[PDB]
Amino acid sequence: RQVTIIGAGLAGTLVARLLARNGWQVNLFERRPDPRIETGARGRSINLALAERGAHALRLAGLEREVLAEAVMMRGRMVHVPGTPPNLQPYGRDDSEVIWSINRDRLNRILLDGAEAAGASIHFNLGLDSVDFARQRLTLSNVSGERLEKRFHLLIGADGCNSAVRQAMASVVDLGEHLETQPHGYKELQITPEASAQFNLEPNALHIWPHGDYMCIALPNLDRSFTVTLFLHHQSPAAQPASPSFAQLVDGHAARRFFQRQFPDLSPMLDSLEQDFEHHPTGKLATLRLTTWHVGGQAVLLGDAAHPMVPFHGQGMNCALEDAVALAEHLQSAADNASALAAFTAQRQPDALAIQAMALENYVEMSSKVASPTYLLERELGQIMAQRQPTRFIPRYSMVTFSRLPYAQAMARGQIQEQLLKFAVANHSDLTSINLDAVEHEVTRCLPPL
Ligand SMILES: Cc1cc2nc3c(=O)[nH]c(=O)nc-3n(C[C@H](O)[C@H](O)[C@H](O)COP(=O)(O)OP(=O)(O)OC[C@H]3O[C@@H](n4cnc5c(N)ncnc54)[C@H](O)[C@@H]3O)c2cc1C
């Protein structure tokens, strides 16, 4: 059984390992050069939040130990707001609930080694150009433009949010594609080990600078450098045309004044802010949903290729790793590749839609809009119910971040919990008019333990 994978990123390299371990002949093609070839280059790859979902997918592949050896433990959040230095807000309810920060290039190199150790052949410096589904052949382009034609039996599209495989599929089947762009862009910035230490930025934490309609978030690296992401409107809306947006930050000097005003404890650590701002492009935020992820038994999409999402729950990589495991499982036990791909799509598509929406709801949190009094009372009640019934009432964030519950079931339980809270608080001022024992009974009736 032979398979061709396009894209030696996170999902593609993991599924290569799993399939090769299961006895598949795996050929993996990647447009970029092999990052394991030693150069003088200082890598500027971002650090990623690896949660229990991703960690478990790596465990199944036998790689968790190697990845975590090169990852920084984030025990909690540091929320930077004016008035006092931040204190750690620890994760969940014990020490075992942490998030790991792993550098993208480090993870990629570990996955590549893992894929080759399992028997996969990885071919770099070759970009997928086109696919011929009738004759079962695809075309790759090399660095100078030479076009190489190859046979495939099964094509896995793991080539990212602008997947060339997906583009090829659209020419033979209606993907039912819907694109939802968001008004925020992002810019990746860097903190050196020296800057971070000078201003005492805690390495073992996730750092956030909230500011209503815009914000920054930073994740640590092994060498004490941090990667910072600014999220900010591309343009100022028609109302509030003076509100901050990238269009006002016409150059690095404007960027610097923006940070000095809005993020004063962060600006001094951004040594290369001006250059980073001008040299790096402003990224776009979008969600892309497809009704179908496969063409018969010939081709399938996974990871960012199948379901681009906004980066606001730190789950795109975690979802991509989950995808790789599921795809390998379905391909190993299916009647033909066509059955495997349909079964895989039916399992993972509802979960992808769920995290895409929950990421957007996490993204919608980033707003200057105040919390309703109703909302605050619901939150207080939910914290009490979480204490009294910790196996039934679990905040949706913890279900997503610290468990392996399928995304769609996390969203379903969150819906039940929110309905329960909405009716318990409906026409009550404060908490003292709410019968907490009666509410706890409703929690027991409506939410089975996990
Ligand atoms: C700012 C930001 C922060 C994020 N933070 C997090 C986080 O904290 N946690 C998290 O879980 N996720 C995070 N994500 C999401 C995460 O980066 C992605 O979901 C993840 O990288 C997708 O993995 P993938 O393997 O599907 O795609 P990729 O990692 O993008 O891999 C695609 C690969 O295919 C290759 N390729 C592309 N086109 C071709 C072609 N034509 N031919 C051959 N090869 C090709 C590319 O070179 C690349 O190697 C973040 C995203 C952004 C933008």
Cβ neighbours for 96, distance < 8 A, ≥ 6 positions apart: none
128 annotated ligand binder:
yes
Q: List ligand 1's pocket residues with C-beta within 6 A.
A: 6-12, 29-32, 46, 48-49, 127-128, 158-160, 164, 186, 229, 283, 303-305, 311, 314-318, 320
One-letter amino acid identity for 273?
Answer: L
Which residue, among 441, 379, 442, has the nearest Cα to 416 in the 3D structure? 442
For residue 302, which atom of ligand 1 is closest to its CA? 26
77 annotated as a binding-site residue: yes
Rounded Cα distance between 437 and 415, Å, is: 21
Ligand 1 atom with the shortest distance to the CA of 9: 31
Q: Residue 71 has which token pair?
A: 């990852």
Structure tokens at 172: 């033979």
Assigned token pair, 337? 């590749």
CA of 305 to the centre of ligand 1 (A): 9
Residue 151 carries which DSSP code? Answer: E
Residue numbers followed by a gap, the chain, C–N over 2.5 Å: none
Token pair 């080759």 is at which residue? 116
Number of helices followed by number of strands (H, E) in the chain: 14, 19
Distance (Å, whole) CA 220 – CA 207:
9
Provide the Cα torsion 27, 30, 31, 36; round to 10°: -130
Q: Which atom of ligand 1 is nearest to the CA of 129?
A: 41
Distance 87 CA to ligand 1 centre (A): 32
Closest CA to 302 of 6, 60, 63, 52: 6
| Residue burial 212-240, b: 16+ Cβ < 10 Å; e: rest | ebbbbbbbbbbebbbbbbbbbbeebeeee
Give residue 337 CA to ligand 1 midpoint distance, Å: 25
Which resolution in angstroms does this entry have? 2.0
Q: CA-CA distance, 214 to 212, in Å (whole number)? A: 5
Q: Which two tokens stand for residue 284?
A: 């776009």
Torsion sign, CA atoms 205, 47, 402, 213: positive
Rounded to 5°, the CA angle 92-94-95 comes to 110
Residues 76, 77, 82, CA angle at the centre, nearest 5°? 150
**Tokens 């609930």, located at residue:** 97
Return d(Cα 350, Cα 282) in angstroms, integer: 30
Question: Beta strand pairing status for 25-29 and 2-6?
Answer: parallel
Of 298, 246, 116, 269, the residue nearest 191 (C-alpha): 269
Strand partners, 379: none
- 190, with CB counted inside 10 A (0-12, 13-18, 19+), is buried
- Those residues with Cβ within 8 angstroms of residue 272's Cβ, 6 or more apart along the chain or in another chain: 189, 190
Backbone angles phi, psi at 400, to 5 degrees: -70, -45
DSSP state of 348: H
Instruction: Write the DSSP string, 289-342.
Output: E-S--EETTTEEE-GGGT----TTSS-HHHHHHHHHHHHHHHHHS-SSHHHHHH
Domains and CATH numbers, the chain: 1-371 (3.50.50.60), 372-450 (no CATH)
Residue with tokens 């920054």: 216
Q: How far is the CA of 298 from the centre of ligand 1 (A)?
A: 23
Cβ proximity of 347 and 326 under 8 Å: yes
Q: What are 309's two structure tokens?
A: 């999402």
Q: Do the annotations mark residue 438 as ligand-binding? A: no
CA dihedral defined by 59, 16, 161, 314, rounded to 10 degrees?
10
CA dihedral 326, 331, 333, 334 (to 10 degrees): 120
| Technique used | X-ray
Atom of ligand 1 nearest to the CA of 49: 8
**162 closest CA partner among 134, 128, 193:** 128
| Residue the block writes with tokens 């075309």 | 139
Neighbour-count burial for 87-106, b at 16+ CB within 10 Å, e otherwise: eeeebbeeeebbbbbbbbbb
Between the CA of 381 and the centroid of ligand 1 the distance, in Å, is: 39
Q: What is the 3-state secondary structure (H, E, C) of 127-143?
A: EEEEEECCCCEEEEECC
CB 49 within 8 A of CB 74: yes
